[PDB]
Every structure is written in C-alpha cells, then in structure tokens.
Design an enzyme around this catalytic site. Structure first.
Site, PDB file in Angstrom:
ATOM      1  N   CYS A 187      -1.126  -2.153  -0.015  1.00 50.48           N
ATOM      2  CA  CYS A 187      -1.487  -1.212   1.057  1.00 50.48           C
ATOM      3  C   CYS A 187      -2.926  -0.678   0.956  1.00 50.48           C
ATOM      4  CB  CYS A 187      -0.477  -0.050   1.126  1.00 50.48           C
ATOM      5  SG  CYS A 187      -0.120   0.752  -0.466  1.00 50.48           S
TER       6      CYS A 187
ATOM      7  N   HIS B 192      -2.148  -1.331  -4.621  1.00 51.11           N
ATOM      8  CA  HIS B 192      -3.083  -1.231  -3.496  1.00 51.11           C
ATOM      9  C   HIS B 192      -3.562  -2.633  -3.196  1.00 51.11           C
ATOM     10  CE1 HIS B 192      -3.400   2.988  -2.849  1.00 51.11           C
ATOM     11  NE2 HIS B 192      -3.940   3.269  -4.022  1.00 51.11           N
TER      12      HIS B 192
END
Ligand SMILES: *SCCNC(=O)c1cc2cc(F)ccc2[nH]1
Ligand SMILES: *SCCNC(=O)c1cc2cc(F)ccc2[nH]1
Lengths: 200, 198
Positions: free
Chosen positions: B130, B88
């Site tokens: 992301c 992430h």
C-alpha cells in the site's frame, strides 16, 4: 450469483486487430502466420456467439479511434465484450503499422466511468504481441509473448471443444499448459468479479 | 492431470513477512492493523495445512535471505510453496524495515531451475502492498480489523479453501472487496487447476 449473467439478446462484440505489415520506419518485419491466427480466431469466436469484426494493418490512430467508437456503442443488450490484438509489442506497448501505442490507452476506453453500458460485464483482452496497468473491475487480459502462433492455436482448439462447458480461467489454464508443453509462457491478469461461462 | 498433484507428505512452506514499523530514513508510517492481518492469515493458512512461519519488521536483506534460504531447502515432499507479503508498496517493489526491495528479486530464487524441487509445483505469492514470469507462479496483488483484501481472503478460504479452485477463491475475494467501495488482481502463470486437498 457466482457467475456473470449471460441472459442478453447477444453475447457481444469481438474486435480483432490483425497487423501483418508494418511501415519500414518502425524496423519491424512482416508477421508471417498472423492471417492463420486471425482466421482461426474469428471462426472460433463467431462460433461462441460473438459478432466478429476483423481489421487489418491498422495505424496507431485507427486502433485508438476504432476502440473509442466501440466503447461509445450501446452494449445494453450484450453479455460481454472481447478484443483481440495480434501485432508487434514491447513492454506495455503495442505496435500499430506506423508506430507504437500503450496497451493501456487502448483498453482505457472500456472503463466503468467511460463505458457505462458495459458495467459489471466482463471485458476480455487477448493480446498476441510477438517481439517482447489498466486496473479496473471485470477486466481480463490474456497476454502471450511466445512466437500460426502456438498460443492462438491452443486458445482456438480448447475454446471450440470446451468453450461452452468450461470457465475462462479453466480454458486459459489449459492454454498455458500446452504452449508450455510445446517446449516462455502466456499469463493471465484477472480483475473479474464472477465466473465466466460463454453458455446459457 | 488437469489438477496439480497434491499427494505429498505436506502442503508446503508458507512464509509470512509482516512489516509494520519502518526505519525513520524512509518516512513510512506505522501500518496499524497489519498484526490483525498477519494473525488472520496465519490461522487461515495453517488450517489449510501450510507450515507457516511469521517474520516481523524484516529488513531488505532479511527478506532476500528468507526467500533465498527458503528456495535452497528441499521441497521433494511438499505439494507447493506460498509467500505472503504485508508491507508498504510502490510500483514493482516492496519495503523492508531499512528501505525498498524489488518484488522480482524475491521470486528469482524460485525460478524454474534454481529450485528444482519446486519445479512443476505452484509457487503462490500473496502481496498486500500500500514483470516477472514463469510456469507455475501465481500472484494475488492488492492495494488499499485488517485490510478488506486480507479479511476477504481469510473468510472465503476458511469456508471454501477445501472445495473451490484457487481462481474461484480469488475471484470471490475480488468481488468481495469491490463490494466495499481500487480492486485486487490475479496474475496467473499456472498450468493446472489448484485445490488444497486430495
Ligand atoms: S502476464 C502479466 C505480466 N506481469 C505482470 O503484469 C505482473 C507481475 C506481477 C507480480 C506481482 F507481485 C504483482 C503484480 C504483477 N503484475
Ligand atoms: S494486478 C496487475 C496490474 N496490472 C498488470 O500487472 C498488468 C496489466 C496487463 C495488461 C496486459 F495486456 C498484459 C499484462 C498486464 N499486466
């Protein structure tokens, strides 16, 4: 194909913003040598086939209005677009004569959604910001922080000798090398989706 | 001397950080498909010739130690080094299992001098989330089978990883994911052309 289509009436526009003198209030001094840069660059880019315009000692409002009006032009008969910024700079910001504007606002005008005439065409930004995120397709940034300028001299020399036979990443890789051999280093942020040759 | 000299015993090390599951206290979801990603990347980079090792659900300190120890190794016989990050991502920062860690701190160990053996040699960072700066670093940074970016990178590399220059590969990757519709970037401080052979 694997390279940008260059079969257009013209190569396209090259905007040079040459900021030498700054308002006392900003605490920035004279940028000596920048005229030599500005001149080498215009000669060089003229020679590649660009239509060169040279602006000098611009305000923040001029740089903004300037570029917005360029982004509103009809670029249908052009292969690409280039803009060169020679000024003072700090993280993500470039100096006008009277202050400071974010590099991102300057480049944002040439965005797929707001500059339909330059869609799928390379948009080139060479920034030479001495004293210290526009994420979209077919953008390329050549940023240099090294204090004519070494970066500018190298760009011009490689470009005038190989401008018609090398791809930009090759040109700018070679540039990185010699500002590096002179001993900071320039960089390159590429969002390009094809290879770029300035020839036909 | 227009290309990085690839004439060494090995290509180099390729670390893969594959963070899928995250500690509750960060409220970060399962990154389904990151395993298809990491496997695709492993086979691809191994085929290029890297000595690949995959680490899963690394904590922030694991990521830091991995890369510090990595830089502390002897790289005299390697052509280059490559780190791949699957996690992430927020602004200039990756996620571990146990929270967040800044991108730059990971590359700091590999600077011009702290890793004298990797000097003059490409350090490649492939980030799928992301500054910083320095000669001979390259970042391929993306935001979103596995992710379109990974899938493209693996396919192009499987096919042309031995005849095209790094920037040609990544440009094609860029174009490919663009075709699917955001867009991956390349930050380059390379001083030579990069080919994965000869
Ligand atoms: S000359 C470009 C200046 N630095 C950046 O804009 C930059 C560095 C970096 C590192 C990453 F891992 C991802 C994105 C990124 N942009
Ligand atoms: S994938 C990289 C995303 N944006 C950047 O990191 C970035 C944009 C940009 C523009 C410049 F003029 C100079 C440096 C720079 N980094």
């Amino acid at each position: 194909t694997y390279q940008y289509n260059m079969n257009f009436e013209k190569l396209g526009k090259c905007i040079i913003i040459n900021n030498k003198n700054f308002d006392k209030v900003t605490g920035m001094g004279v940028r000596n040598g920048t005229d030599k840069d500005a001149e080498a660059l215009f000669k060089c880019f003229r020679s590649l086939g660009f239509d060169v315009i040279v602006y000098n000692d611009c305000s923040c409002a001029k740089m903004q209005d300037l570029l917005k009006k360029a982004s509103e032009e009809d670029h249908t008969n052009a292969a690409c677009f280039a803009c060169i910024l020679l000024s003072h700079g700090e993280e993500n910001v470039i100096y006008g004569k009277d202050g400071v504007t974010p590099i991102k606002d300057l480049t944002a005008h040439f965005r797929g959604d707001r500059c339909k005439t330059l869609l799928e065409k390379p948009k080139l930004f060479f920034i030479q910001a001495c004293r210290g995120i526009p994420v979209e397709a077919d953008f390329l940034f050549a940023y240099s922080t090294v204090p004519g300028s070494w970066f500018v001299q190298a760009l011009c020399s490689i470009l005038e000798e190989h401008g018609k036979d090398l791809e930009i990443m090759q040109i700018l890789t070679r540039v990185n090398d010699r500002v590096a051999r002179h001993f900071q280093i320039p960089c390159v942020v590429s969002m390009l989706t094809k290879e770029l040759y300035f020839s036909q």
